[PDB]
Amino acid sequence: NARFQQWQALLGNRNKRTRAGEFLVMGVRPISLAVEHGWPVRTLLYDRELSKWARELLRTVRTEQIAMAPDLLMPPEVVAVVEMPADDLDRIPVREDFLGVLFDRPTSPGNIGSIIRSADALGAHGLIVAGHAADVYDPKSVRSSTGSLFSLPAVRVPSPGEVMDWVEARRAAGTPIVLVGTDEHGDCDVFDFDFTQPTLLLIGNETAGLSNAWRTLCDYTVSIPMAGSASSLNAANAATAILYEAVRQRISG
Amino acid sequence: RNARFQQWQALLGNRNKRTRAGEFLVMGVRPISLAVEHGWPVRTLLYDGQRELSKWARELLRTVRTEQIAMAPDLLMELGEKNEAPPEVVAVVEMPADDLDRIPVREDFLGVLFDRPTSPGNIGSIIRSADALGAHGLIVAGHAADVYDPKSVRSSTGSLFSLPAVRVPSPGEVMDWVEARRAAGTPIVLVGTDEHGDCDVFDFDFTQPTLLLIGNETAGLSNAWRTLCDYTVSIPMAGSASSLNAANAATAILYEAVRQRISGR
Numbered sequence: 001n002a003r004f005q006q007w008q009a010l011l012g013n014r015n016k017r018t019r020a021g022e023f024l025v026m027g028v029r030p031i032s033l034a035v036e037h038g039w040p041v042r043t044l045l046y047d048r049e050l051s052k053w054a055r056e057l058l059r060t061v062r063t064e065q066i067a068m069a070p071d072l073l074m075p076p077e078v079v080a081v082v083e084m085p086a087d088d089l090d091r092i093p094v095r096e097d098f099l100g101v102l103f104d105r106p107t108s109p110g111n112i113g114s115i116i117r118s119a120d121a122l123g124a125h126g127l128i129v130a131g132h133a134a135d136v137y138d139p140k141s142v143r144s145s146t147g148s149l150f151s152l153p154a155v156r157v158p159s160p161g162e163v164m165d166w167v168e169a170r171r172a173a174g175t176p177i178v179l180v181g182t183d184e185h186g187d188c189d190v191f192d193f194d195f196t197q198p199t200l201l202l203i204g205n206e207t208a209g210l211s212n213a214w215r216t217l218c219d220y221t222v223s224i225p226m227a228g229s230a231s232s233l234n235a236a237n238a239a240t241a242i243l244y245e246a247v248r249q250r251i252s253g
Numbered sequence: 254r255n256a257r258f259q260q261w262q263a264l265l266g267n268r269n270k271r272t273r274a275g276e277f278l279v280m281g282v283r284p285i286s287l288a289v290e291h292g293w294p295v296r297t298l299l300y301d302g303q304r305e306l307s308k309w310a311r312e313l314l315r316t317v318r319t320e321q322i323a324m325a326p327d328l329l330m331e332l333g334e335k336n337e338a339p340p341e342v343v344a345v346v347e348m349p350a351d352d353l354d355r356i357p358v359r360e361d362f363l364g365v366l367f368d369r370p371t372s373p374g375n376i377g378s379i380i381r382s383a384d385a386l387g388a389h390g391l392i393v394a395g396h397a398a399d400v401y402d403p404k405s406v407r408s409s410t411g412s413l414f415s416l417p418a419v420r421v422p423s424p425g426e427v428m429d430w431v432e433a434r435r436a437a438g439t440p441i442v443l444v445g446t447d448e449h450g451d452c453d454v455f456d457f458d459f460t461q462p463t464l465l466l467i468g469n470e471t472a473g474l475s476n477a478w479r480t481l482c483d484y485t486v487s488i489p490m491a492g493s494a495s496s497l498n499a500a501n502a503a504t505a506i507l508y509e510a511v512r513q514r515i516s517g518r
């Protein structure tokens with residue numbers, strides 16, 4: 001095996017993932033979402049069982065198709081090498097009902113995936129991973145997104161200044177996006193805020209909150225009421241709940 | 254190394270071992286602190302023997318009245334994340350009995366049942382959200398993922414020590430306990446959760462005493478629990494495509510209960 005070892009390097013460290021511009025995706029369901037949403041598939045790896053769905057995948061996705069022994073597939077029956085898109089902020093569409101999420105400096109890839117799943121499911125339009133972060137294309141992120149990665153554009157952006165240039169430009173085409181930070185001890189209960197406006201929701205780190213550079217640029221900062229001093233919420237759970245509040249207002253009136 | 258060491262190491266694997274020994278491992282100065290604060294008996298306190306020893310570790314050692322063993326750093330990498338964080342202290346904590354009476358039941362009861370979880374991390378996450386949003390207890394049904402799995406404990410971020418969590422094999426024991434609470438004067442309603450549920454979560458009355466049922470990641474709620482439900486509720490979704498992780502869903506709905514209870518809207 002040789003080109004196999006290039007595929008194995010994509011599981012481990014993100015340096016090699018970035019240079020090749022591609023990543024691993026497993027499961028008939030995730031791959032089909034990738035095909036359906038226009039993501040390129042350079043290679044398609046497959047085990048003797050084979051499902052009805054996996055079979056239909058082979059005779060429909062017209063790309064390089066390679067058989068593998070059960071041994072080497074590490075427990076999945078299909079794996080795809082998928083073309084990683086460019087990190088363009090215009091992949092996120094901005095309309096009058098904008099609802100987006102920024103995740104500030106996350107250390108948990110699992111948490112990124114979770115946010116994508118939740119933002120996809122609750123009708124948000126895009127996610128931004130800002131700053132020195134764990135990789136959107138890390139397998140823990142791909143897995144826990146559950147295929148939402150392909151329907152909900154996640155864009156990676158090292159500088160917070162580049163996010164502000166895009167936001168200000170969206171503002172210039174009449175779309176009054178408000179930045180809404182989130183925090184345990186904020187100035188405004190989450191259910192008192194008007195989520196019917198175009199909204200970019202800023203979600204903080206697991207150990208630090210939001211950076212202080214993001215708290216300054218926030219128009220408003222909202223909080224979910226908590227039972228006590230000792231308690232707080234995980235990033236993905238908290239963000240799910242706020243996104244849900246937004247949907248509720250938008251549906252309620 | 255030691256035969257003592259091998260018994261503690263075996264507390265990382267299957268659930269039956271921890272149950273029969275009546276103990277589990279708590280890793281880190283902070284979660285061990287919350288165990289001592291909320292009164293969990295500590296049987297043994299292990300620590301680094303070629304010592305960095307921080308102030309916090311040192312305060313634990315001289316404050317907790319228990320057996321105290323210096324251990325070599327290598328041994329102490331029993332579990333952390335074989336990648337993230339060797340702990341300088343690890344406690345052997347006593348596991349409480351699986352008695353539902355540990356969950357207090359009042360007129361404004363709010364409880365959660367998690368039905369045969371596949372993933373232990375999800376349990377701890379629910380423990381942490383239920384704790385933080387004012388739920389009064391967690392029940393975990395089945396012999397799947399275990400409340401006292403290291404991933405569950407780690408994931409609860411200490412909340413395991415303040416929010417009572419009880420394991421039950423099957424619905425039967427839970428129903429005996431619910432009917433008993435109803436007879437004593439608290440009309441607990443069983444509320445199942447499902448993407449295709451009978452009514453929207455914000456159209457349901459969460460001010461009433463509630464046991465909220467959260468299903469598992471790949472199967473949802475079992476058919477036995479759907480049959481026992483007084484009602485089913487749903488977070489509306491964007492399409493027929495995505496769905497929600499169980500802890501995330503449970504957090505959204507616990508939050509909804511909290512919102513209604515801040516009396517009104």
Ligand SMILES: C[S@@+](CC[C@H](N)C(=O)[O-])C[C@H]1O[C@@H](n2cnc3c(N)ncnc32)[C@H](O)[C@@H]1O
Pocket residue numbers: 182183184185202203204205206207208209210222223224225226232233234235236238239
């Ligand atoms: C574990 S908290 C961060 C810890 C906290 N900022 C600190 O000073 O230690 C992770 C993230 O989830 C969100 N979060 C957690 N609990 C929240 C709450 N009660 N209200 C609003 N956001 C919350 C926030 O966005 C926060 O940045």
Ligand SMILES: C[S@@+](CC[C@H](N)C(=O)[O-])C[C@H]1O[C@@H](n2cnc3c(N)ncnc32)[C@H](O)[C@@H]1O
Pocket residue numbers: 446447448449450466467468469470471472473474486487488489490496497498499500502503
């Ligand atoms: C991944 S979901 C269940 C999966 C589903 N039965 C399936 O077809 O695979 C895990 C649990 O989270 C909760 N949940 C997820 N999405 C929900 C939603 N939209 N409304 C209410 N509960 C939801 C439910 O308790 C559910 O059982």
